Write an enzyme that holds these catalytic residues in place. Structure first.
Site, PDB file in Angstrom:
ATOM      1  N   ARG A  39       0.794  -1.253   0.000  1.00 33.15           N
ATOM      2  CA  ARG A  39       0.000   0.000   0.000  1.00 33.15           C
ATOM      3  C   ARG A  39       0.830   1.310   0.000  1.00 33.15           C
ATOM      4  O   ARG A  39       0.718   2.107  -0.921  1.00 33.15           O
ATOM      5  CB  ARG A  39      -1.049   0.026   1.119  1.00 33.15           C
ATOM      6  N   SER A  43       6.358   1.142   2.185  1.00 33.85           N
ATOM      7  CA  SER A  43       6.427  -0.314   2.121  1.00 33.85           C
ATOM      8  C   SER A  43       7.120  -0.771   0.831  1.00 33.85           C
ATOM      9  O   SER A  43       7.909  -1.704   0.853  1.00 33.85           O
ATOM     10  CB  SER A  43       5.032  -0.910   2.247  1.00 33.85           C
ATOM     11  N   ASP A  65      -3.915  -1.012  -2.791  1.00 34.08           N
ATOM     12  CA  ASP A  65      -4.716  -0.761  -1.596  1.00 34.08           C
ATOM     13  C   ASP A  65      -5.960  -1.640  -1.689  1.00 34.08           C
ATOM     14  O   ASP A  65      -6.793  -1.441  -2.570  1.00 34.08           O
ATOM     15  CB  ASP A  65      -5.074   0.727  -1.499  1.00 34.08           C
ATOM     16  N   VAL A  66      -6.063  -2.667  -0.851  1.00 36.44           N
ATOM     17  CA  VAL A  66      -7.264  -3.518  -0.912  1.00 36.44           C
ATOM     18  C   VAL A  66      -8.590  -2.813  -0.594  1.00 36.44           C
ATOM     19  O   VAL A  66      -9.652  -3.426  -0.724  1.00 36.44           O
ATOM     20  CB  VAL A  66      -7.175  -4.802  -0.051  1.00 36.44           C
ATOM     21  N   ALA A  96      -7.020  -1.689  11.767  1.00 30.94           N
ATOM     22  CA  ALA A  96      -8.092  -1.094  12.571  1.00 30.94           C
ATOM     23  C   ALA A  96      -7.519   0.175  13.168  1.00 30.94           C
ATOM     24  O   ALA A  96      -6.312   0.299  13.228  1.00 30.94           O
ATOM     25  CB  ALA A  96      -8.543  -2.023  13.667  1.00 30.94           C
ATOM     26  N   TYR A 156      -8.123  -6.903  22.113  1.00 26.20           N
ATOM     27  CA  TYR A 156      -8.002  -7.142  20.689  1.00 26.20           C
ATOM     28  C   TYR A 156      -9.273  -6.641  20.021  1.00 26.20           C
ATOM     29  O   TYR A 156      -9.298  -6.333  18.822  1.00 26.20           O
ATOM     30  CB  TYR A 156      -7.867  -8.636  20.465  1.00 26.20           C
ATOM     31  N   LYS A 163     -11.405 -10.778  12.641  1.00 23.27           N
ATOM     32  CA  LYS A 163     -10.784 -12.096  12.425  1.00 23.27           C
ATOM     33  C   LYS A 163     -11.801 -13.246  12.343  1.00 23.27           C
ATOM     34  O   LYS A 163     -11.625 -14.184  11.542  1.00 23.27           O
ATOM     35  CB  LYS A 163      -9.678 -12.381  13.449  1.00 23.27           C
ATOM     36  N   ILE A 192       3.624 -11.835  17.614  1.00 19.05           N
ATOM     37  CA  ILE A 192       4.919 -11.599  16.998  1.00 19.05           C
ATOM     38  C   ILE A 192       5.122 -10.083  16.954  1.00 19.05           C
ATOM     39  O   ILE A 192       4.240  -9.333  16.511  1.00 19.05           O
ATOM     40  CB  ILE A 192       4.970 -12.200  15.572  1.00 19.05           C
ATOM     41  N   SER A 196       2.443  -3.466  13.100  1.00 21.96           N
ATOM     42  CA  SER A 196       1.032  -3.411  13.435  1.00 21.96           C
ATOM     43  C   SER A 196       0.768  -3.835  14.866  1.00 21.96           C
ATOM     44  O   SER A 196      -0.162  -3.355  15.509  1.00 21.96           O
ATOM     45  CB  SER A 196       0.194  -4.255  12.484  1.00 21.96           C
TER      46      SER A 196
HETATM   47  N1  LIG Z   1       2.060  -9.754  14.370  1.00 22.50           N
HETATM   48  C1  LIG Z   1       1.172 -10.517  15.014  1.00 22.50           C
HETATM   49  O1  LIG Z   1       1.345 -10.713  16.387  1.00 22.50           O
HETATM   50  C2  LIG Z   1       0.000 -11.217  14.347  1.00 22.50           C
HETATM   51  C3  LIG Z   1      -0.593 -12.337  14.917  1.00 22.50           C
HETATM   52  C4  LIG Z   1      -1.628 -12.984  14.258  1.00 22.50           C
HETATM   53  C5  LIG Z   1      -2.069 -12.505  13.030  1.00 22.50           C
HETATM   54  N2  LIG Z   1      -1.505 -11.389  12.487  1.00 22.50           N
HETATM   55  C6  LIG Z   1      -1.943 -10.909  11.174  1.00 22.50           C
HETATM   56  O2  LIG Z   1      -0.843 -10.967  10.301  1.00 22.50           O
HETATM   57  C7  LIG Z   1      -1.054 -10.089   9.219  1.00 22.50           C
HETATM   58  C8  LIG Z   1       0.213  -9.296   8.944  1.00 22.50           C
HETATM   59  O3  LIG Z   1       0.403  -8.318   9.939  1.00 22.50           O
HETATM   60  P1  LIG Z   1       1.850  -8.087  10.614  1.00 22.50           P
HETATM   61  O4  LIG Z   1       1.767  -8.340  12.050  1.00 22.50           O
HETATM   62  O5  LIG Z   1       2.833  -8.678   9.680  1.00 22.50           O
HETATM   63  O6  LIG Z   1       1.951  -6.503  10.539  1.00 22.50           O
HETATM   64  P2  LIG Z   1       2.606  -5.550   9.441  1.00 22.50           P
HETATM   65  O7  LIG Z   1       4.008  -5.949   9.225  1.00 22.50           O
HETATM   66  O8  LIG Z   1       2.308  -4.230  10.048  1.00 22.50           O
HETATM   67  O9  LIG Z   1       1.837  -5.844   8.075  1.00 22.50           O
HETATM   68  C9  LIG Z   1       0.502  -5.396   7.963  1.00 22.50           C
HETATM   69  C10 LIG Z   1       0.305  -5.144   6.488  1.00 22.50           C
HETATM   70  O10 LIG Z   1      -1.029  -4.760   6.285  1.00 22.50           O
HETATM   71  C11 LIG Z   1      -0.992  -3.962   5.124  1.00 22.50           C
HETATM   72  N3  LIG Z   1      -2.241  -3.212   4.918  1.00 22.50           N
HETATM   73  C12 LIG Z   1      -3.008  -2.594   5.876  1.00 22.50           C
HETATM   74  N4  LIG Z   1      -4.019  -1.971   5.240  1.00 22.50           N
HETATM   75  C13 LIG Z   1      -3.916  -2.199   3.913  1.00 22.50           C
HETATM   76  C14 LIG Z   1      -4.672  -1.797   2.816  1.00 22.50           C
HETATM   77  N5  LIG Z   1      -5.751  -1.047   2.997  1.00 22.50           N
HETATM   78  N6  LIG Z   1      -4.300  -2.186   1.548  1.00 22.50           N
HETATM   79  C15 LIG Z   1      -3.181  -2.973   1.353  1.00 22.50           C
HETATM   80  N7  LIG Z   1      -2.414  -3.325   2.441  1.00 22.50           N
HETATM   81  C16 LIG Z   1      -2.797  -2.985   3.692  1.00 22.50           C
HETATM   82  C17 LIG Z   1       0.178  -3.012   5.387  1.00 22.50           C
HETATM   83  O11 LIG Z   1       0.628  -2.303   4.244  1.00 22.50           O
HETATM   84  P3  LIG Z   1       1.129  -0.752   4.300  1.00 22.50           P
HETATM   85  O12 LIG Z   1       2.096  -0.609   5.452  1.00 22.50           O
HETATM   86  O13 LIG Z   1       1.714  -0.475   2.939  1.00 22.50           O
HETATM   87  O14 LIG Z   1       0.037   0.241   4.598  1.00 22.50           O
HETATM   88  C18 LIG Z   1       1.173  -4.001   5.973  1.00 22.50           C
HETATM   89  O15 LIG Z   1       1.974  -4.500   4.929  1.00 22.50           O
HETATM   90  C19 LIG Z   1      -2.264  -9.253   9.606  1.00 22.50           C
HETATM   91  O16 LIG Z   1      -3.388  -9.809   8.980  1.00 22.50           O
HETATM   92  C20 LIG Z   1      -2.375  -9.449  11.106  1.00 22.50           C
HETATM   93  O17 LIG Z   1      -3.681  -9.127  11.546  1.00 22.50           O
HETATM   94  C21 LIG Z   1      -0.471 -10.776  13.117  1.00 22.50           C
HETATM   95  C1  LIG Z   2      -4.043  -8.496  23.254  1.00 23.09           C
HETATM   96  C2  LIG Z   2      -3.733  -8.777  21.787  1.00 23.09           C
HETATM   97  C3  LIG Z   2      -2.831  -9.979  21.630  1.00 23.09           C
HETATM   98  C4  LIG Z   2      -1.774  -9.701  20.559  1.00 23.09           C
HETATM   99  C5  LIG Z   2      -2.364  -9.667  19.163  1.00 23.09           C
HETATM  100  C6  LIG Z   2      -1.417 -10.347  18.188  1.00 23.09           C
HETATM  101  C7  LIG Z   2      -1.562  -9.571  16.899  1.00 23.09           C
HETATM  102  C8  LIG Z   2      -0.709  -8.500  16.658  1.00 23.09           C
HETATM  103  C9  LIG Z   2      -0.892  -7.751  15.504  1.00 23.09           C
HETATM  104  C10 LIG Z   2      -1.960  -8.008  14.640  1.00 23.09           C
HETATM  105  O1  LIG Z   2      -2.143  -7.259  13.500  1.00 23.09           O
HETATM  106  C11 LIG Z   2      -2.970  -6.186  13.682  1.00 23.09           C
HETATM  107  C12 LIG Z   2      -3.579  -5.865  14.895  1.00 23.09           C
HETATM  108  C13 LIG Z   2      -4.427  -4.764  15.024  1.00 23.09           C
HETATM  109  C14 LIG Z   2      -4.690  -3.975  13.914  1.00 23.09           C
HETATM  110  C15 LIG Z   2      -4.057  -4.293  12.713  1.00 23.09           C
HETATM  111  C16 LIG Z   2      -3.228  -5.391  12.593  1.00 23.09           C
HETATM  112  C17 LIG Z   2      -2.622  -5.734  11.347  1.00 23.09           C
HETATM  113  N1  LIG Z   2      -2.132  -6.028  10.370  1.00 23.09           N
HETATM  114  C18 LIG Z   2      -2.828  -9.065  14.915  1.00 23.09           C
HETATM  115  O2  LIG Z   2      -3.863  -9.302  14.065  1.00 23.09           O
HETATM  116  C19 LIG Z   2      -2.642  -9.842  16.056  1.00 23.09           C
END
Ligand SMILES: NC(=O)c1ccc[n+]([C@@H]2O[C@H](COP(=O)([O-])OP(=O)(O)OC[C@H]3O[C@@H](n4cnc5c(N)ncnc54)[C@H](OP(=O)(O)O)[C@@H]3O)[C@@H](O)[C@H]2O)c1
Ligand SMILES: CCCCCCc1ccc(Oc2ccccc2C#N)c(O)c1
Ligand SMILES: NC(=O)c1ccc[n+]([C@@H]2O[C@H](COP(=O)([O-])OP(=O)(O)OC[C@H]3O[C@@H](n4cnc5c(N)ncnc54)[C@H](OP(=O)(O)O)[C@@H]3O)[C@@H](O)[C@H]2O)c1
Ligand SMILES: NC(=O)c1ccc[n+]([C@@H]2O[C@H](COP(=O)([O-])OP(=O)(O)OC[C@H]3O[C@@H](n4cnc5c(N)ncnc54)[C@H](OP(=O)(O)O)[C@@H]3O)[C@@H](O)[C@H]2O)c1
Ligand SMILES: NC(=O)c1ccc[n+]([C@@H]2O[C@H](COP(=O)([O-])OP(=O)(O)OC[C@H]3O[C@@H](n4cnc5c(N)ncnc54)[C@H](OP(=O)(O)O)[C@@H]3O)[C@@H](O)[C@H]2O)c1
Ligand SMILES: CCCCCCc1ccc(Oc2ccccc2C#N)c(O)c1
Ligand SMILES: CCCCCCc1ccc(Oc2ccccc2C#N)c(O)c1
Ligand SMILES: CCCCCCc1ccc(Oc2ccccc2C#N)c(O)c1
Ligand SMILES: N[C@@H](CCC(=O)O)C(=O)O
Ligand SMILES: N[C@@H](CCC(=O)O)C(=O)O
Ligand SMILES: N[C@@H](CCC(=O)O)C(=O)O
Lengths: 255, 255, 254, 255
Positions: A39, A43, A65-66, A96, A156, A163, A192, A196
């Site tokens: 997006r 990035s 941009d989705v 969010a 969350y 989700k 992790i 975000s």
């Molecule tokens: N990290 C965790 O603890 C965790 C745990 C479970 C699940 N998840 C899920 O894993 C996925 C990846 O997140 P992450 O933790 O890797 O964080 P991240 O590195 O911050 O990646 C989030 C990505 O979402 C993209 N995005 C947000 N809005 C968008 C839009 N409107 N159009 C296109 N791209 C968009 C961002 O792109 P831009 O920066 O270019 O805007 C960014 O590349 C998410 O679905 C998150 O909810 C994360």
């Molecule tokens: C108490 C909470 C426990 C920890 C949660 C683990 C977790 C971290 C980052 C995540 O990613 C997002 C979270 C919020 C908004 C946008 C994104 C994005 N992308 C996610 O989905 C889940």
């Protein structure tokens, strides 16, 4: 596995700590051709710098941009024009507001609730639809979820409901594209440290609870999610669809 | 289970076949004072007529389109002025466009997807927020879901994903409102011939298959949802929150 | 209201039994109650507990569910003494103490099968026998714990027996549904009972619920019995093969 | 997923059709060393003839009837002496009498119920306890279940309650042994024509329905269970434990 002659689209690398970058490394190591969508111009900048660590002979980068049907439609169309048919899509996108995440859930605004749904769940549906045209003989589609989609986890909040929506989206998409030989699955990643993640209240203390309580007594990492992704994106997982694999040290399995 | 000197708000009676009217008959039969909310003109008229079957000495009717914050905020404010503190709310509301209940899920429009979320899930969050103000002492909130929120059911499509979201909404509301002594639960009703059921492709089929396959070998009706709602809306079910109760003749349990 | 209803209640040991919570609530709702105890000790005890209730008579039967014949003759007698019944409340489980702490992986064959036998299989034989006394349908309710759904530290072999009991319910539901017998589980939060002394780190769980459950408080035997009232009565027609968590909302959160 | 200098014990091959020989063909393919356990002398004779199609340079065959503590205990001990340290166990073992696989579940005998529990669930616990002895470094244990464990499937009866027990067994073993880095998971396979499937009433019917109703519109085979086994038993699945992966063309996800 082994993934030569395969082409995957990866959506949602922001930086080196993105989960989708863990996916990228694993796939790249396994011989896959990768195409990347982003997006923010920032990035893309990070992507160009992260490709140097990869084996990709070619940068294949697309702004999508989705939120915009046009950008998804035109993106996937230009991807097929550039690389031909593809074998699967890794979806790693959610969003969010802060302002709604650090509310009582009951205080969530309508515009923030729907924003979360739009980017975090709907977007898979349209991506699936556009990607499908580049998969005339089938393929695989993986989205990333979190256990706060199955249970209510303090803080969350709105993202949990998005989700839950995403995890059903996977099941309905799997039912629908199944006859096209397209498989659709979710990885429920444990917590992790990502960009975000900084937006979610109480992240650090959940990390710590995992180490104390999860069966493997430790947290996971992007590469672990990436290894499970390679399984789901490869022929290893033929027969698997509509599934949600927890890559989370077994934390989902206890109370 | 006697409900005299209880007041409940019932949302989403359209006509005599409505699930919420099953709920009303039971609650009224148990002595509750009832307030009703509607969207369409035609629905208020039906309600006026249906009230003649109930023991409700006055008619408390409110037009509330849950697409509007102002209507929900002002509606619940009026209710508190007219009847005082309430003891619970029964939510029997959902919507999606006809073409999103048949054919292929992967072709769901963005506006169709978000419309279904808004009305069928987000509305609970905002209703709970406002209903809370009328429950200083605690109370009970019930929403109506369907098995298709838990599993991909052919044709239920975009609604399946909105019920998944709704079911999570219930969990997160329970977690949030719990310390205020407000319980939030779902009834997952089996198929029942209502006006909205006419928009779902393949509905007659699903009904027959319940008679052939579910444990009790028969379909349920609105009164049976109603008696479970009475349980959840009453003190009989103290200790029960974030729960989803299937009133579906056991169908949820088999495969 | 459960007037002219007759229910069998299995597994009262003392004033703190979950089944006594169920008894009081059903008794309060006008039902006739039959009790089944395991050993003569609980007899003198039960007799004293029923001075609380409004039962005009003591219907009391020793049944150890480890014996087919005691279950078979037991229900057979209940039918002769009291006639047709309207449902069964199962509040019965067992595991050896050494298996309820330390390491699940160290569970003996004998201790694992004991737990399956008493805590799970007994429902099946109870249902088959109890069915004979409910020709026009009825309602059967067993007691489980969240530990049959998730691995809960210490609960160990009982968690695998509960997982077993929760599937037994499903299968009893499918089989007995065409006879109009509904079978459900109540998954109770933690409660200080006689048997909960044998579970490791039970006090630690009690406090977690207070801190972490939506209701920020624990449940009691009376709340379990109120939900059993629902499940045993016509209010819950339509509902079978279900597991309702009376657990201050703990199951819904992580 | 290359498995050279890995060693796995594969329990429960009876013939060319066994699910466990699916696994074996796959693990063998990927370069693992394999150790086989059997019960009936006929299963050894079958193993000896099937070994000819594997790349294994030697036959490692142990007779273990998992009803005997002594035979499990001595079997594994012996395995350790013969091939040294192992990387994982694939458990493909269940049993129930034919009476208790048809007609009425409520008529299951005590003896039949405990026999299914003993062979089909308890055996995992003692196998994990003894196999833990040969995995000081960590490892991976995978057991084979069926959706009949999570829902009531007509005819599956006593085995479904045994599979529930098994799935929970997997969860508790994952909690208990995680601190030793031993992952325990389950594969929920779709219906597959095997010797033991001949014992289950209505098996042919279920096969046909999966084809009509499962998202992929086809049945799965043993080799597909092996491909997922290879994933669960290797480092590819390093953050995954207490999990149940349904290899079943989607069926689990639909109602
Ligand atoms: N990290 C965790 O603890 C965790 C745990 C479970 C699940 N998840 C899920 O894993 C996925 C990846 O997140 P992450 O933790 O890797 O964080 P991240 O590195 O911050 O990646 C989030 C990505 O979402 C993209 N995005 C947000 N809005 C968008 C839009 N409107 N159009 C296109 N791209 C968009 C961002 O792109 P831009 O920066 O270019 O805007 C960014 O590349 C998410 O679905 C998150 O909810 C994360
Ligand atoms: C108490 C909470 C426990 C920890 C949660 C683990 C977790 C971290 C980052 C995540 O990613 C997002 C979270 C919020 C908004 C946008 C994104 C994005 N992308 C996610 O989905 C889940
Ligand atoms: N019948 C079934 O088989 C079944 C099974 C499971 C769950 N459910 C659920 O049960 C609930 C009730 O549905 P039903 O079958 O009883 O059908 P119904 O009689 O058609 O009721 C649907 C109600 O939703 C209201 N509604 C829709 N959009 C609204 C809005 N924007 N603002 C306020 N009200 C709105 C309608 O009001 P107006 O007509 O005034 O517009 C109508 O009263 C729904 O949640 C449905 O998804 C139904
Ligand atoms: N308390 C909790 O936190 C909790 C939570 C969830 C579920 N549960 C479940 O609730 C149920 C009741 O337990 P409780 O906590 O109320 O404990 P309890 O008062 O000790 O009652 C347990 C009963 O089981 C009876 N019993 C054991 N083996 C028997 C046998 N072989 N034949 C006949 N009766 C037998 C005991 O009889 P004797 O005393 O005569 O030996 C006792 O009456 C159990 O199923 C338990 O698993 C309890
Ligand atoms: N086929 C399916 O549709 C299906 C679906 C999902 C799950 N499963 C599961 O897959 C696993 C393998 O079954 P399968 O279909 O491949 O059937 P199979 O080829 O008939 O194998 C079953 C194996 O269990 C072994 N066994 C039974 N009791 C034993 C005991 N006491 N000690 C040691 N081994 C014992 C048998 O050995 P002997 O012949 O030497 O006695 C046989 O090798 C089972 O857990 C089954 O429940 C099967
Ligand atoms: C796949 C067929 C299964 C039968 C489905 C049972 C069912 C019928 C009607 C339902 O109600 C709505 C459906 C669509 C749009 C709005 C409403 C509303 N209000 C519902 O939620 C579930
Ligand atoms: C760490 C776990 C937290 C507390 C669990 C709540 C709980 C308490 C008592 C229970 O009852 C039994 C337990 C063991 C053996 C027999 C019975 C009986 N009867 C039960 O099933 C569950
Ligand atoms: C209602 C039909 C459902 C389709 C069945 C799928 C299935 C087939 C065979 C299975 O194996 C056994 C079954 C019973 C007893 C022993 C074994 C063994 N070994 C299994 O576990 C599940
Ligand atoms: N990110 C901080 C701030 C959250 C808040 O204060 O709401 C936390 O870990 O909670
Ligand atoms: N309601 C009709 C029309 C379905 C359709 O073709 O969309 C049915 O499915 O039986
Ligand atoms: N193999 C037969 C079993 C016959 C019976 O139980 O009547 C079937 O497919 O059901």
């Amino acid at each position: 596995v082994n993934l030569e002659n395969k082409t995957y689209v990866i959506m949602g690398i922001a930086n080196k700590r993105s989960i989708a970058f863990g996916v990228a490394k694993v796939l790249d190591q396994l011989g896959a051709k990768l195409v990347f969508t982003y997006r923010k111009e920032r990035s893309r900048k990070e992507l160009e710098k992260l490709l140097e660590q990869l084996n990709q002979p070619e940068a294949h980068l697309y702004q999508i941009d989705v939120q915009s049907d046009e950008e998804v439609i035109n993106g996937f169309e230009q991807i097929g024009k550039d690389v031909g048919n593809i074998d699967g899509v890794y979806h790693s996108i959610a969003f969010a507001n802060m302002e709604d995440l650090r509310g009582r859930f009951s205080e969530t605004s309508r515009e923030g609730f729907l924003l979360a749904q739009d980017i975090s769940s709907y977007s898979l549906t349209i991506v699936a639809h556009e990607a499908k045209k580049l998969m005339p003989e089938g393929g695989s589609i993986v989205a990333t979820t979190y256990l706060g989609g199955e249970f209510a986890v303090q803080n969350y909040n709105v993202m949990g409901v998005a989700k839950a929506s995403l995890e059903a989206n996977v099941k309905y998409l799997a039912l629908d594209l199944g006859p096209d030989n397209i498989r659709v699955n979710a990885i429920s990643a444990g917590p992790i440290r990502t960009l975000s993640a900084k937006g979610v209240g109480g992240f650090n203390t959940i990390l710590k609870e995992i180490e104390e309580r999860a069966p493997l007594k430790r947290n996971v990492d992007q590469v672990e999610v990436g290894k499970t992704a390679a399984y789901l994106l490869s022929d290893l997982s033929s027969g698997v669809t509509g599934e949600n694999i927890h890559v989370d040290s077994g934390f989902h399995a206890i109370k």
